[PDB]
Ligand binder design. Structure first.
Ligand SMILES: [Fe+3]
Length: 325
């Protein structure tokens, strides 16, 4: 059983999280435009993207940390900088939403990585912005739960994906947090039977978004441990559809992104170094990958906007339910 009682979103809140005004659309797209540039490790546009993320979240009065370091790669020594934003640093437990902000250095030409992961980056910032008032209110409760957003650097391989060439930022951060010791007594309102020995134990669940923005994604539950959390995403999507709040190409259709079916697939991503340290993971990545995956066609025009809108409604409702906004 999940360590936190997961109370179903009231209808009033579901309906609110499920509407998207044209200024909602406009705000998200304006956010997204900042990420639809090549973001290769070490580059100027990469530092500009990080600066944008940092300022956006500092403007919202979040605590923002830049976890920077240099690491050896097949292309020589490289600088990396993870961005960690925490709404209430004192709160013992974090609901962590994450993605990567670097883009693949593509051998053929300029690679935008619109789904991989410009859309997930923008979705995290859009969540922070659009739920800001509710989040600021939730932070005052002293209930020991907060929201945390991690934008990992160096997710992509420089050459052939391997244990040593991939996940530079997440490998670094998981180790950093594992070795940084702390205890429940130093923290605000930890749950009763919490075993807190280090920073990594404060990660209540890590929801990792990746390869989003293409039409008709298929998600599955990748971890039995987080099946209670995963099923809330299934339930929210079902309720949005029942209420007629999803955008579909024709009348009398339903989205079915979050399957209840079992899968036996394994995908390496930024969750791995945390998974190895007992952090519960929900991996929101489609299977199969978008047809555009790691091609020069993973670009702005190939994004499917109605799907992005539907996903934003699900994620907003999810956060709202988890934090009881
Ligand atoms: Fe990729």
């Amino acid at each position: 059983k999940w360590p936190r009682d997961l109370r179903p979103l009231a209808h009033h809140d579901l309906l609110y999280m499920g509407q998207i005004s044209e200024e909602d659309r406009g705000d998200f797209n304006a956010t997204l435009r900042n990420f639809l540039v090549p973001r290769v490790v070490g580059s100027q546009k990469h530092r500009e993207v990080r600066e944008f993320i940092v300022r956006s979240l500092k403007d919202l009065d979040w605590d923002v940390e830049e976890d920077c370091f240099d690491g050896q790669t097949p292309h020589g020594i490289k600088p990396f900088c993870n961005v960690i934003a925490t709404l209430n640093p004192s709160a013992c437990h974090r609901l962590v939403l994450a993605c990567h902000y670097d883009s693949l250095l593509h051998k053929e030409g300029t690679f935008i990585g619109a789904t991989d992961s410009a859309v997930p980056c923008a979705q995290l910032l859009y969540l922070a912005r659009s739920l800001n008032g509710k989040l600021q209110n939730q932070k005052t409760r002293g209930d020991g739960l907060t929201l945390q957003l991690v934008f990992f650097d160096g997710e992509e391989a420089f050459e052939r994906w391997s244990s040593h060439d991939s996940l530079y930022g997440s490998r670094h951060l998981a180790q950093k947090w594992h070795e940084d010791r702390t205890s429940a007594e130093r923290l605000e309102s930890c749950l009763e039977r919490s075993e807190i020995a280090n920073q990594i134990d404060r990660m209540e669940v890590m929801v990792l978004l990746d390869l989003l923005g293409a039409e008709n994604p298929r998600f599955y539950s990748y971890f039995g441990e987080t099946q209670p959390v995963y099923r809330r995403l299934v339930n929210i999507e079902s309720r949005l559809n029942d209420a007629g709040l999803m955008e579909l190409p024709r009348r009398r259709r339903r989205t079915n992104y979050f399957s209840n079916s079992s899968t036996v697939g394994f995908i390496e991503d930024d969750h791995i170094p945390f998974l190895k340290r007992s952090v519960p993971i929900v991996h929101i990545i489609p299977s199969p990958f978008p047809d555009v995956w790691h091609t020069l066609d993973d670009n702005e025009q190939n994004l499917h906007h109605p799907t992005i809108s539907n996903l934003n409604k699900i994620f907003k409702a999810f956060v709202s339910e988890y934090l009881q906004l």
